[PDB]
Amino acid sequence: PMSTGTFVVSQPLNYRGGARVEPADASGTEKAFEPATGRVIATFTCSGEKEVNLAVQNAKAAFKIWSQKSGMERCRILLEAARIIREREDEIATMECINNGKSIFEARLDIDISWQCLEYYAGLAASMAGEHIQLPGGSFGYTRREPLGVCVGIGAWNYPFQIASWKSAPALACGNAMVFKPSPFTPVSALLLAEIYSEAGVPPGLFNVVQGGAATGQFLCQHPDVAKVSFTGGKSPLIIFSDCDMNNAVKGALMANFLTQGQVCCNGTRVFVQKEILDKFTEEVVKQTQRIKIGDPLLEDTRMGPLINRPHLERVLGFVKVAKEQGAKVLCGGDIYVPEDPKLKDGYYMRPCVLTNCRDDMTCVKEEIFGPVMSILSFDTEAEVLERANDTTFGLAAGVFTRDIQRAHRVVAELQAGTCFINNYNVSPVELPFGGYKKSGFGRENGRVTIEYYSQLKTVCVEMGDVESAF
Amino acid sequence: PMSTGTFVVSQPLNYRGGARVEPADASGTEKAFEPATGRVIATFTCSGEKEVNLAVQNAKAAFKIWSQKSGMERCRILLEAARIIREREDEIATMECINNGKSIFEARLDIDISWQCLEYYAGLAASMAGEHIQLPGGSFGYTRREPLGVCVGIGAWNYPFQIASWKSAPALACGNAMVFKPSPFTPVSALLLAEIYSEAGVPPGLFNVVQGGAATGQFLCQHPDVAKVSFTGGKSPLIIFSDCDMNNAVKGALMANFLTQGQVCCNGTRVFVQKEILDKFTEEVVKQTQRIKIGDPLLEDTRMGPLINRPHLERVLGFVKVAKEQGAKVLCGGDIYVPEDPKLKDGYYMRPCVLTNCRDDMTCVKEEIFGPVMSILSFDTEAEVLERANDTTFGLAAGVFTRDIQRAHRVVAELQAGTCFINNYNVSPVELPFGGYKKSGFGRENGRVTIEYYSQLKTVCVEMGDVESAF
Amino acid sequence: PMSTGTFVVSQPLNYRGGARVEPADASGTEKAFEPATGRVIATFTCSGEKEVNLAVQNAKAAFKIWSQKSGMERCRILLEAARIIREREDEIATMECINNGKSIFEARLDIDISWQCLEYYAGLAASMAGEHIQLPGGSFGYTRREPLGVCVGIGAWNYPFQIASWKSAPALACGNAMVFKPSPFTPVSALLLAEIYSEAGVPPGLFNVVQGGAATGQFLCQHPDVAKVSFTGGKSPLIIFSDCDMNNAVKGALMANFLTQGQVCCNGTRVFVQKEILDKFTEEVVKQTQRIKIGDPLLEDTRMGPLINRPHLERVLGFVKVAKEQGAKVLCGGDIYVPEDPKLKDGYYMRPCVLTNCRDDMTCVKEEIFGPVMSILSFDTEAEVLERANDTTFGLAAGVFTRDIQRAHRVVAELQAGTCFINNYNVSPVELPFGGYKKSGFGRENGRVTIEYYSQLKTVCVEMGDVESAF
Amino acid sequence: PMSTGTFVVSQPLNYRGGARVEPADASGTEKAFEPATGRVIATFTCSGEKEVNLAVQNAKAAFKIWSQKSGMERCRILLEAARIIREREDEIATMECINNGKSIFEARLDIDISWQCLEYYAGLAASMAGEHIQLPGGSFGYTRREPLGVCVGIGAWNYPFQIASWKSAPALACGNAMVFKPSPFTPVSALLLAEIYSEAGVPPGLFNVVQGGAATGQFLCQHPDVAKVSFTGGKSPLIIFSDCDMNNAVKGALMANFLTQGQVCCNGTRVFVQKEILDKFTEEVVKQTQRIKIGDPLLEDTRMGPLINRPHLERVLGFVKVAKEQGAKVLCGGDIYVPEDPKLKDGYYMRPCVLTNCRDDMTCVKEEIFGPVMSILSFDTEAEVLERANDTTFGLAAGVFTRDIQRAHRVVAELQAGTCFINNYNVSPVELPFGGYKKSGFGRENGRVTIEYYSQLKTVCVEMGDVESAF
């Protein structure tokens, strides 16, 4: 029932004690946009010290109720929330599209990851166990993972609903309360999650929302009743060898660069192509790039939406200008795009860019752009690429395309990237295990480790006999 | 063959590439003492930036060799190290006593923990595995725990050999190298571990030692080739109820206060005693305290050695003076002790102190002393104690003495302490699981969690089929 | 909308390919009853060899489809099944009462365990992973837990819907098909589960139901295409010491003996009471037993329903007759009960029995009755009870009532029972972890172990280098 | 110090109470041989019912002591046993060859796995923990893995010392005793393990040895005080595709067939070779097979020793005769071998056999020979091999040789074998994880699962509040 060019926020954008509330305090005002049209969908207040304290106080009170509930009870409520997310999926997805600009196609995938996340941690809540140890003379020791208390979740604008779910679901599962601060660019979708938690049966104040930027963030970090804060080198390389499957290598390169309008750090933007296939590959990539459907993100066939902001679009367009000044050849795009739909005339659109004759010294190769810009770097040998792509940090991903699996594993072994892809590339947030493949699951280690972030181990030792005095 | 009043360091105190070396660069000079006699056992150079660089560079080189060895090979070496520590135990324990001042009796327990710790992480090294996940169409995702590289360990003076062992054993078991900076108070024992690692078969420079203070520490933290750095409300309460086992409560109180000369934060120095037993308990506690054998730490019957240095002893005596000014009754000790052996005359000795008529407003009750000082606070009800001991942080321990186990579990539940003891109290470092009970073992969570600190998870996704393009 | 004295089966009681079917081959005929009224609710054919073959062949085909689906897809379906069980709970619970005779109070608790069980194994399906190991020279090894194929589940009459869910949920979560053979006494409720699995989206034939007894069972076990079969000394002691909480000890004794009409092996029927409290306890237990509401199991206030069938009721009454012949004093019950409601006149009712002056030589003390019969044995010392109750097997449970927790732990340590209760008793099936406490959860070991029963570990080794020939 | 043609057993071959004993009771007599010479090294008594009882009663007494020792103490003893095995390795390995006939080369590998096994389970013993669960109102539930009691380990003749170690280490690590029955062919080496356990500090009776056959085995299974018994369709295929690395494929085929004189079921004896490379491969395999050094197993350069005994050697030669009658071409070997050393003149030697023009209808292809016999079957397509090798059971292994990894993984997926090898083949016992690769480790799952086999989970529930009565 919701469409592009019509949405306007009509309710308060903070959320405390199970209801939408206006900030009690100001730390500034921000404007949220519909990137597809360039319309202001909200002029909202950033939360001040007093508003931040009301949220934390109200979450501390909920924490006391929720932490005392069983893992079984907590699981029940989180599984309900996942069911509500699943039922209201298209409504949630369209709202994320309206405010962020990603295609409905990509918003649905992010929403899926969100309710899957909830189910996973709900399951972990119901199956949590500590250790029990036997001590001589009937004595014993035991451990328990306990919540920390009020957790602060800091959002980002690229995956607003998903970052909200990903932070709250494990924190809540362990028995914590959370005060969530969305990115000021994207305030809207986090409130849908807040409402859903309430509807599911979460105690009022367990999941609170405070809008604001840096000042709000500082107030949250400095708060004495806040237990923990959950925040959110060379760029991600993609190595294409001459022996690879060309069609799959091209598909992978496009997915690596133009999903989420290339606005993510997990994007494999440094495309190293072997000299022999270099000409054939570039020809095919440009042909395919020029065919990407740009327009209204609510349209099912749209694959490229607008960029997050006008400042952001301008910054990306500046990278393109610097690249051709540094000697790169713009094969296609990197120009402002004006869509055929008149309602989209002032949207933050640009044609996806493919740059060739790229060098390691270039700032477009050295720096993360956060726009749809592919840098094609030519290479000759396996030793050369490994030497050129060594500067990759653990926090980044990497992709390798070669029919030789000895070569593939050898390249992956030497690469310092945390996530490596052989004959594929997935653009998925860092938190998601196994490179965010659809039918992957989460394994057990991801959950165990993220649970440890939102908890602490309490140890109890019960002496059944007499004390062994050294004195 | 080694005794008190005779030891003098005759070799360099830094350790690089399998040998004792002298600092290349200097950041100051320090004096290490024999606390039992007050003798200078070493005048050593604090490592400067160039010395810190040589250590990290030599360890970066060792890591490259060691990380490539199998977990089985790494286990083999760490098990040999444990065997050597076990064989050379008395020699290591006397060295620990000479520089630190703890009784031989307590030093042996710390050396036992140290070789047990190596055996544990050796075992984990041999049994480490990542996850394997199945993906549609014969594709698969998998994970590997990888070492980080060069890790920094920062020693403390209260458990020198044990802290060196505790930080280096997991770090090395993951495939990392380590540059260790002992407390400048206690430089000696870390070199015995250094030598043992070499003897066990560790590649040269895998476990390096840099002496120094804050300046050396800063150069280590600021070093770009350093992957990780492992560093070392109210104080620990002990609640004695009128229904408890008096003899066990007294034994527990003495252990909680006078082990390691009361110089640890783990010590349960805030002793809350119920009004009825208060008189009977204090009488027994003073009787038992006055019987603690003070003297040469290398003597088998010694239970109390000297304090770490003269500044620390003076600071502790200052606390006692302020306490009697604040209105506390010194029941015994808190005075400088002159041992009967003349060689021990300038040792940092004091009689263990018992203070009564203590208040929550007193600085001796509010502040951690790091000396043998017991503060006895009278209480009337269970609600009162819980309200008075609520200010305890998670990093601290707590002890409860009551014959009513419902009362015991109720008290432990309300207490915020990370380690709670029912009808006992163990003074053991926070790292040690299950309150450091002698025949406890480590369980599996401790090892798993500490391994995660010294490692990182690498994910590889192997696509067996074709790429599913969104475009 | 469903009530006692009106239900009659109107559909076939076998289930294959997503529909109810009449057995293709016979192995006899059975009659299922409404124990509350003594009415025949069904006359059904026991499955023959050809019918058993059709169900295993059908399951083998569904297995091939299901085992190829992802853990995530399997989880989705199982969570839908749990949702449907939860929605249709009262309808399932009344059906369980109608055929089995347990109170709706207990029936609801049984249906709760069933859908909780489903959710737990759905969660495990989505998080399943094998191991990944690194081998020298880039080679690697990995494991995968694979389904077995067609699994066979044998039902029991005391927990019909619960046993069906408990066996099918883990088997299905792994990727197996299941042919389920309910107890001929209770054929009805398993078909509600089979219909729910279908409704949830399970492939036709993944959960097939074959009616029959021993012959049907043998054919299933003998079948070559059946991977695995899941089947359904002294008796469970309850030790009441003179120092215990009398009211809690009485409540625990009633729960331990008269839940599920005392028709389970988990029942703590051997009640050892210390000489001093023996008189006081017996007086209170009889007073409380005589207050148990016997009647229509569909009534909310009913705590005791009828016994499974007339043969069973007669067998239990026989035990009571032998007991008074052996010298026991029937304090209350053990007599045929004729309920006030005329529609229940022909139901399998008896008054719950309390026997005193019991001896270890008595057959009522030596043998499991499977009826509401409590045997009170007097005892004098802790050493005496431990000697008299030592004959308890690991498969049984045990209960201890004492205010002294050292005594409690000492008794539990010496007892050979697999499940021990201190100051409580739960009557729960063996499969359920942590003595089947409400708000316990399942922990992680239970699920892990039961998943291992329904799966097998496949190992794959990928050689990346050259083969190291011994020759 | 020990050499071929000189060894004679001079001590009793049963072991009870920390000493070698003569069986109390008999069930026949057997002769043990030196397969290299054909000499009788022992004429020993098979254990009767009374001897089996004495061993069990003795073990039961040591269990009571050992089960009460801490996990830490058992670990210490098992690590000592591993150290003694490691020190006395060459002595144990020569004894293993003397009686079994495997090459000292392979015997040393067996002995390595043995002491590695002990270390792994020693580590698990020290780190064992149960679960702890929190229940409402301060109540709690906890689990503990307890030993079973007296376990029985049945030996095999192909890995005598290794099987003894593989069964005794997890049982003893769990707190059980074990009564071990070696294969009557190989009685000697198990006594070396028995002696070592004693020397390490194991209580007398912990690891007892009863010599005997099937009769002795039955007595052990039938014994009422025995808790558990640990016992020892087409054959293992090896698929060589035309696209593979020929030299590696040949090496792998020789390893798969001629290691342990081809006397194991894990040997990949069904060698399917693609029509194109068939001629080239056969030529190379025969060339390499003819170069295998047959002789004194104690000689360092020996790769093939004699077969276990005269009957086995004769049975294998019979298979070769039937094969050429069925139409197979003996390319090399399958003939009695007379070694140049005159002391080995009556040893059970034969030349390793290579058969070509093999059919699926042949008994040499259908049946497991347990001798050095390779059956080369020609094939044309991938679909054909998968159809011909489908009959492989889960208990068997499989090997695939192809440069195409998609093909390799596709073949491995379709194969029903429990262990699959890509571009390699390891002949290792089933118990060993990750196809028994040298620097593999055991991972965590293997140990977890073999501990569960030798233990039972005891659950304790502590009620802190009031009993919730249904009545």
Q: By CB neighbour count within 10 A (0-12 exposed, 13-18 middle, 19+ buried), where does D287 fall?
A: exposed
**Which CATH number belongs to the domain containing residue C286 in this structure?**
3.40.309.10
Report which secondary-structure segment, H or E, holds A169: helix A160-174
By the 8 A CB rule, do D108 and D162 touch? no
In the numeric block, which tokens belong to residue B341? Answer: 């052996």
Contact across the interface for C73 and A123, Cβ inside 8 Å: no
Q: Does B422 touch chain D (CB under 8 A)?
A: no
Distance from CA of B100 to the nearest CA of A (A): 19
Whether D127 and B70 lie within 8 Å, measured CB to CB: no
Q: Write down how long chain A is.
A: 471
Contact in structure between C55 and C212 (CB atoms under 8 Å): no
B131·C134 Cβ contact <8 A: no
- Sequence-ordered alpha helix ranges (H) in A20-155: 49-66, 71-87, 89-100, 104-126
Say how far apart CA D265 and CA A110 lie, in whole Å.
Answer: 50
* Rounded CA separation D158/A19 (Å): 73
Selected catalytic residue, list A46, A75, A265, A332: A265
Q: Which amino acid is at B219?
A: F
Burial of C452 (0-12, 13-18, 19+ CB in 10 A): middle
Q: Render the burial of A68-78: b for 16+ CB within 10 Å, e for the rest.
A: ebbbbbbbbbb
- What does this entry list as its resolution, in Å? 2.5
Q: Is C19 exposed, middle or buried (0-12, 13-18, 19+ CB in 10 A)?
A: middle
Tell me which chain B residue has its CA closest to the CA of residue D128: B443
Q: Within the 39-98 window of chain A, which residues sit less than 8 Å (CB to CB) from chain D? A: 70
Cα-based distances in Å from C133 to C15, C138, C143, C413: 44, 11, 9, 40
Residues 6+ apart with CB under 8 A from D29: D43, D44, D45, D46
DSSP-derived letter for residue C298 is T
Task: Indicate which residues of B carry an active-site annotation.
Answer: 265
Closest CB from D83, D413, D464 relative to B409: D464
**Which run of H or of E encompasses D173?**
helix D160-173
- Which residue has tokens 């003897």? B199
A281: which 2 tokens? 């590959």
Active site (annotated) includes residue D265: yes
Give the nearest partner residue to A138 out of C79, C123, C410, using CB atoms.
C410
A355 and A217 part of one domain: no
Q: Which residues of B touch C131 (CB under 8 A)?
A: 129-132
The single residue of D117, D174, D244, D265 carrying the catalytic annotation is D265
Q: Domain total for chain D?
A: 2
The contacts of residue D133 (CB under 8 Å, 6+ apart) are: A129, A130, C434, C440, C441, C443, D140, D141, D142
- Reported as type and span, the H/E element at residue D237 is strand D237-240
Q: Are the beta carbons of D260 and D158 closer than 8 angstroms?
A: yes
CA distance A184 to chain C (A): 34
- The candidate with the shortest Cα–Cα distance to C201, out of C114, C70, C79, C55, is C79
D132 to chain A: which residues are within 8 Å by CB?
A: 129-132, 142-144
Looking only at the bridges linking them, the beta strands covering B19-21 and B14-16 are: antiparallel
Name the residue among B355, B319, B313, B315 with its Cα closest to residue B336: B313
CA-to-CA distance for D256 and D425, rounded, in angstroms?
6
CB contact C133 to B (< 8 Å): yes
**A vs C: CB pairs below 8 A:** 84
Q: Residues C75, C244, C265, C461: which is the catalytic one?
A: C265
- Contact indicator for A286, A331 with CB cutoff of 8 Å: yes
User: Which stretches does DSSP call E strand in B79-174?
Assistant: 130-134, 140-147, 150-154
Q: Which pair of tokens denotes residue D231? A: 């016992």
Residue A248, Cβ neighbours under 10 Å: how many? 17
SS3 C370: coil
Q: How far apart are CA D421 and CA A200, in angstroms?
A: 49
Q: Mutual orientation of helices C71-87 and C189-200 as an angle, nearest 10°? A: 130
Q: Are residues A430 and A394 in the same domain?
A: yes
Q: What is the CATH number of the domain that holds D116?
A: 3.40.605.10
CA neighbor of C374 nearest in space, from C269, C291, C247: C269
Cβ–Cβ gap C470/D259 under 8 Å: yes
Q: Which residues contact A106 (CB under 8 A, 6 or more apart)?
A: A259, A260, B470
The torsion angles phi and psi of C362, rounded to 5 degrees, stand at -70, 140
A415 shares its domain with A288 = yes
Question: What single DSSP character describes residue D260?
Answer: G
In order, the DSSP letters of A395-431 are TSEEEEE-S-HHHHHHHHHH---SEEEES------TT
B34 φ, ψ to 5°? -100, 100
Residues of the domain holding B279: 235-445
CA distance to partner chain B, nearest, from residue D327 (Å) = 40
Q: Given a contact as 3+ CB pairs under 8 Å, which chains touch B? A: A, C, D
Same domain, C246 and C205: no
CA dihedral C370, C375, C381, C387 (to 10 degrees): -40
Cβ contact B454:B151 at 8 Å: yes
- What pairs with residue C294 in β-bridges? C304
Per-residue DSSP letter, D463: -
Interhelix angle B104-126/B445-453, nearest 10 degrees: 80
- The shortest C-alpha distance from B373 to chain D (Å) reads 34
* Signed CA dihedral, D187, D193, D197, D199: sign only: positive
Same domain, A272 and A289: yes
Answer yes or no: do A387 and A462 share one domain.
no
C384 vs C379: CA distance, rounded Å: 7
B441·D128 Cβ contact <8 A = yes
Handedness of CA D101, D102, D104, D108 (dihedral sign): negative
Q: At what angle do helices B275-289 and B246-258 cross, to 10 degrees?
A: 60
* C-alpha span between A338 and A346 (Å, rounded): 8
Question: What letter represents residue D287's amino acid?
Answer: K
Among chain D residues, CA nearest to A144: D132
| Chain C residues within 8 A of B403 when measuring between CB atoms | none
Please check whether residues B52 and B120 belong to one and the same domain. yes
Instruction: Classify residue D359 as exposed, middle or buried by CB count within 10 Å of its CB (0-12, 13-18, 19+).
Output: middle
- Please give the Cα distance from D296 to D94 (Å, whole number): 11
B287 lies in the same domain as B348:
yes
Q: What is the CA radius of gyration of chain C?
A: 25
Subunit contact B441:D119, Cβ cutoff 8 A = no
Helices (H), D13-159: 49-66, 71-87, 89-100, 104-126
Q: Do both A125 and A197 map to the same domain?
A: yes
Specify whether B370 is located in the same domain as B331. yes
Regarding whether A116 and A90 lie in a shared domain, the answer is: yes
B126 with D442: Cβ contact below 8 A: yes
Exposed, middle or buried: residue B456 (CB in 10 Å: 0-12, 13-18, 19+)?
middle
A438 shares a domain with A370? yes
Q: Which two tokens stand for residue C463?
A: 């050689």
What is the SS3 assignment for C106? Answer: helix
> Is the separation of the CB atoms in B323 and B362 below 8 Å?
yes
Are the beta carbons of A438 and A451 closer than 8 angstroms?
no
By residue count, chain D amounts to 471
* Set of chain A residues whose Cβ sits within 8 Å of the Cβ of D147: none
Neighbours of C, requiring at least 3 CB pairs below 8 Å, are A, B, D
* CA–CA separation, A461 and B435 (whole Å): 7
Q: Give the minimum alpha-carbon distance from D316 to chain A in angstroms, rounded to a whole number.
A: 40
**Touching subunits for chain A (3+ Cβ pairs under 8 A):** B, C, D
Q: Which of residues 102-131 of B touch D (CB under 8 A)?
A: 116, 119-120, 122-124, 126-129
